[PDB]
Design a protein around this nucleic acid. Structure first.
Lengths: 50, 50
DNA sequence: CGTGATATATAGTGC
DNA sequence: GCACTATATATCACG
């Protein structure tokens, strides 16, 4: 895919996610994504607060 | 795992990755991660260019 | 033409 | 206190 790079956000790094893709997963700003360690990779799953 | 708030980095959203997680997978700033779409979730895996 | 992306700074709070 | 969290701005590069 796109060769995007992870830059530093003030102090801690942040994975810049294309706003276009955010709409595909149906999530928005302030969303609580659950970072779980699976297969030695970062599984980012958006957890809705209903 | 750890739930993080996807805030707005300027105009684009970004998944904040705590330094604690950086040390875990031995990744750093200015690295390249493969943003894959599996299970309707964001698959973030560090793909070092070495 | 508009906003999505990049760079950057800061005050504050919980870990 | 430091990592972490929340917020705001200028400017461009891309759609």
């Amino acid at each position: 895919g796109i060769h995007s790079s992870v830059k530093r956000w003030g102090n801690s790094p942040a994975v810049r996610i294309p706003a276009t893709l955010m709409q595909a997963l149906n999530l928005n700003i302030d969303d609580e994504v659950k970072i779980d360690l699976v297969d030695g990779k970062l599984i980012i799953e958006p957890v809705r607060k209903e």
